[PDB]
Design a protein around this ligand. Structure first.
Ligand SMILES: OC[C@H]1O[C@H](O[C@H]2[C@H](O)[C@@H](O)[C@@H](OC[C@H]3O[C@H](O)[C@H](O)[C@@H](O)[C@@H]3O)O[C@@H]2CO)[C@H](O)[C@@H](O)[C@@H]1O
Ligand SMILES: OC[C@H]1O[C@H](O[C@H]2[C@H](O)[C@@H](O)[C@@H](OC[C@H]3O[C@H](O)[C@H](O)[C@@H](O)[C@@H]3O)O[C@@H]2CO)[C@H](O)[C@@H](O)[C@@H]1O
Lengths: 588, 588
């Protein structure tokens, strides 16, 4: 029992309101250092004789990362007010952790010793559109999906798929192409399309916005967008658009004016300009995305720039009915803006998925007053290092997955954007060194993990390539090229996910196999149903023992449909190289 | 090194923008475990020759508590963007602490391992009024200060000072009384007056409001309030009113109504009612302050309530130019509401001090989007447990002191409302058990601590009594009965506080004393100023040595005036029981 490692603080991941009456509490201890923990809790004003009235509830260890045990307790305070503490036991030896420090005995003559959650407010409750939890995304890079209309393909467009993607090449893909391949997506199981920037911009990626109210001429038109979205909506698909608000393009109307007028520009305060007139040599004299001259940072602090951006935001929702906004480099925009952004957006269309792009611990942006989710990169890094690269062991993977999960609140975790790759990364199959068997595992872990999974175009058919622009080759539409074992694999898994809530929203726990270096075993539970997953992460066959109690326990193979039961001597599966299996557990 | 004890989370007290180009980073470690710490930092996009240009800035240990060491670092990102990690040294052993975990050597092929502080936006910077940081408040209980206008006292009042008050007694205290005695305060040094509730309320404490827009008649009228405030302004004193928004009183018009027309009431949504019709037996079927039927909880999520309390907030400010609101039981009101509260208030009178009564860690209400400051109860707890009750040791008081301070951002601690007692706690003299010496040590530690200190009426003249109602006696105006020793003592200190910047805005640290059981040596510094204080929390004469490097060292007794130099053998200090001394330190 080492106090040095004990920790809890009343906010974010450690203390939060799950729903209106239930609030969850976490505690963190040294790995294996504690046996059991009990939450001390009671209404702040419940008193009898100079004694505070409390109840004791045991906490359950929900996971462990490299060097910490995480404990969980969910209490529905009688009057929505609560004061709590923790009683730690190490082989019957006890300790008392509170806001005022530790003690051998439980203080009861005042409540200032204890941590406090003053009151459960419905309006503060974190809440992300429920649908996203059941959705399964497919990110599209319009320029390279499908050229469904050549008349508007920019001059120079290379023959589709012909050569390798360069920073300045074009192939003529357009929104019409997407409308032209929607069934394909509807067949895969996709239920949401996330598109990358489409508003008019010089480049092929469109991350350097030219006009936030115009559909890039080469992609199509308002008329064309609407039909895309409506066609998607009738097919049961939601549409997410990308919003590059951190900065604009060199060609942004206002920026041009500041450049050709400088100090006297009607828009000098629209940017982060230090010296006049603007320069670029050696480096820019005005803040930019990184050090890119064509991407001058917008000043979201100016009431105008702010009004404008808020207009753009509501415009598209109000005029096209998109179901969400993906906002890149969002972590670089001030919280004050994001606070409004939500207010306005949510005022218009309540269940709009506001996904901010953040490449690090995003807790400050996931409290309920801003984004609904972020890009779960820790998930990405993890899954790849284990399944694809094979650089970390299974205990390590379980460690990092638990580490990222206990880092946020449960409801925030339920709406996490889980992707294995993107337009800014290498192609998952290329990371797998070309091993399809591995990619199969990624999708497997992806599609059984709680949250909102996203699939990068072509990763389901086996596309390959390095990192940007290499990961942006044209979609592959010829069957003789698109690895079908994967298609059916993905398609198959997407089906299971829709079928099993535990997969979509349940809790995850890792069972210790007799080799935490190549075999990974875990299960998903939403309290009602339970699915079990066993993976053989190695290039050899293996006989794996399923660690389950057999009393009234039945397992169902979700891939073959087969069924059977665990006896007074349960069994052990055995998969081939990179093999796997899913079992629905029944407790009769 | 103890990895499990090392900790850092990019937010709240650990990472925060101090100003518009300077941000603070803080790290936690097991006390004495780490030799040195260095902050590894650099701009997220400054790469050259394929290597991330990052620098190594050494960190400073600003204190420790029971179990930890706290390290500090001040950094100005060249482009207001920053990626960082921490490097720890213990002998030859090296650890690199990052968002992605511990490493035994600086990873450099990426910036993702590192903790991140995206951008420095002025709109996200924390800012409490500055005037507050040089103020010294005096808390008054209008009912017990002075019966300036005996024509409006309530029927039944007792001759001023007749006997010990009761929860229902009245001594006809009024606002005129305050005005009449302003000179007494102007003489003491008071530069800020905080008043408890003054709006219409059947009680003698007025915490159960009847009408937020009416000044209790027995206290005075709108007109009388102006003059008190206008007169206060010319004597250079700020005025702060106490607003009770968490709950109303049984006599509050809207509630009375619900109490007549149940579920049909046009106001049933201004409260937290569980079943209709309302009931108080066996217990109230509606949420109240604690379990007090007379105090119905307002539902600040309701749009009408919300708009109402906001108008009340800006009404008095707007028409009476008050200098700040002390918001009662603020931790039980939703965050969203406080966010409007600040928006509204600040747009009206930016320098309005927004103080919230939160009896526990309040990090969540102090991010700059809600409260400017809260009652620093931890302060009071430590201060009394050591100087008054003599329960904890000096070392303990020290840790407790650092523990709190390090749980908040330097700029937040800069505006803390540091009080020793209220109309809710007993009397400081009564807690010292009569010893005027101990109490005298309290004013000392209070008036040498950073923040905004406050003095309970009478404390400065030796008034006594137990916990509510006993602590709310009638202000002793008889010179034959008030304790003039303390008065001057207090008048003496507030003066030094005024002239010694380092005393109100400086950093604090505890010079390890020999008898780490009864002596306390600490100094205050703001970068230039440097005051040192030595206290003999003992009932015996003590010879206490001064731990200071004496190469160009000049001490200045801020009490006698005497000046002297420090020699190789650090000068020792002789002090009587419970004696004390403050020196000004000059390095030449
Ligand atoms: O300017 C050159 C590149 O611009 C565009 O890159 C986009 C990127 O595609 C988009 O996802 C986003 O990325 C945000 C992150 O960028 C880096 O990875 C930082 O480390 C991280 O802190 C950011 O959050 O924004 C950029 C800029 O618009 C083009 O897509 C890319 O092809 C160009 O090479
Ligand atoms: O009739 C009930 C009481 O009402 C008033 O009490 C005030 C109190 O003076 C004011 O500071 C504030 O206190 C809130 C705190 O109350 C307790 O101390 C809890 O331990 C703490 O957690 C709360 O934050 O609000 C109450 C209610 O108005 C009268 O002053 C008091 O005499 C009455 O008993």
């Amino acid at each position: 029992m080492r106090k040095e490692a004990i920790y809890h603080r009343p906010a974010d991941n450690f203390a939060y309101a799950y729903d209106s009456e239930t609030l969850h509490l976490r505690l963190r201890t040294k790995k294996d250092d504690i046996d059991r923990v009990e939450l001390l809790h009671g209404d702040p004003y419940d008193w009898q004789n100079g004694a505070w009235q409390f109840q004791m509830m045991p906490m359950r260890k929900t996971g462990s990362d490299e060097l910490f045990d995480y404990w969980f307790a969910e209490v529905k305070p009688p009057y929505r007010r609560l004061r709590y503490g923790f009683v730690l036991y190490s082989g019957e030896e006890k300790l008392v952790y509170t806001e005022k420090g530790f003690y051998f005995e439980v203080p009861t003559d005042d409540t200032a010793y204890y941590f406090c959650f003053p009151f459960l407010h419905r309006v503060d409750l974190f809440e992300a559109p429920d649908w996203v939890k059941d959705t399964v995304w497919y990110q599209i890079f319009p320029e390279r999906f499908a050229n469904g209309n050549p008349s508007i393909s920019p001059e120079g467009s290379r023959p589709w798929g012909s050569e390798d993607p360069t920073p300045t090449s074009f192939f003529g893909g357009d929104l019409q192409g997407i409308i032209d391949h929607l069934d394909y997506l509807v067949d895969l199981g996709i239920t949401g399309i996330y598109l990358t920037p489409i508003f008019r911009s010089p480049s092929n990626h469109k991350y350097d916005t030219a006009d936030y109210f115009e559909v890039d001429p080469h992609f199509g038109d308002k008329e064309t967008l609407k039909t895309l979205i409506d066609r998607c909506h009738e097919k049961g698909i939601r549409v997410m658009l990308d919003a590059v608000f951190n900065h604009c393009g060199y060609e942004f109307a206002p920026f041009q004016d500041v450049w050709k007028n400088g100090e006297s520009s009607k828009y000098k305060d629209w940017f982060h300009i230090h010296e006049f007139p603007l320069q670029t040599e050696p480096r820019p004299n005005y803040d930019t995305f990184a050090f890119v001259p064509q991407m001058p940072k917008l000043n979201t602090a100016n009431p105008e720039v702010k009004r404008y951006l808020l207009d753009v935001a509501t415009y598209w929702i109000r005029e096209f009915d998109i179901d969400g906004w993906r906002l890149d480099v969002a972590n670089e925009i001030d919280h004050e803006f994001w606070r409004e952004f939500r207010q306005e957006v949510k005022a218009l269309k309540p269940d709009v998925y506001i996904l901010g792009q953040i490449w690090h611990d995003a807790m400050p942006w996931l409290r309920g007053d801003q984004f609904d989710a972020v890009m779960n990169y820790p998930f990405t890094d993890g899954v790849l290092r284990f399944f694809a690269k094979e650089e970390i062991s299974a205990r390590q993977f379980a460690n990092q997955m638990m580490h990222v999960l206990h880092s946020y609140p449960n409801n925030v975790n339920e709406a996490a954007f889980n992707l294995l790759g993107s337009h800014d990364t290498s192609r998952i199959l290329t990371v797998c060194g070309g091993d399809i068997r591995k990619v199969k595992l990624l999708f497997l872990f992806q599609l059984t993990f709680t949250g909102s999974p996203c699939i990068y175009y072509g990763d389901e058919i086996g596309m390959t390539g390095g990192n940007d622009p290499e990961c942006r080759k044209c979609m592959v539409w010829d069957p003789m090229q698109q690895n079908k074992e994967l298609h059916q694999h993905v398609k198959q898994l997407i089906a299971l996910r829709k079928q099993y809530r535990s997969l979509r929203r349940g809790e995850i726990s890792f069972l210790h196999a007799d080799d935490e270096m190549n075999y990974l075993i875990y299960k998903k539970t939403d309290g009602d149903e339970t699915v079990l997953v066993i993976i053989n992460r190695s290039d050899q066959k293996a006989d794996i023992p399923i660690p389950l109690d057999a009393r009234g326990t039945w397992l169902v193979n979700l891939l073959t449909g087969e069924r059977f039961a665990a006896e007074a001597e349960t069994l052990c599966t055995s998969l081939p190289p990179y093999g796997f299996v899913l079992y629905a557990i029944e407790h009769w």
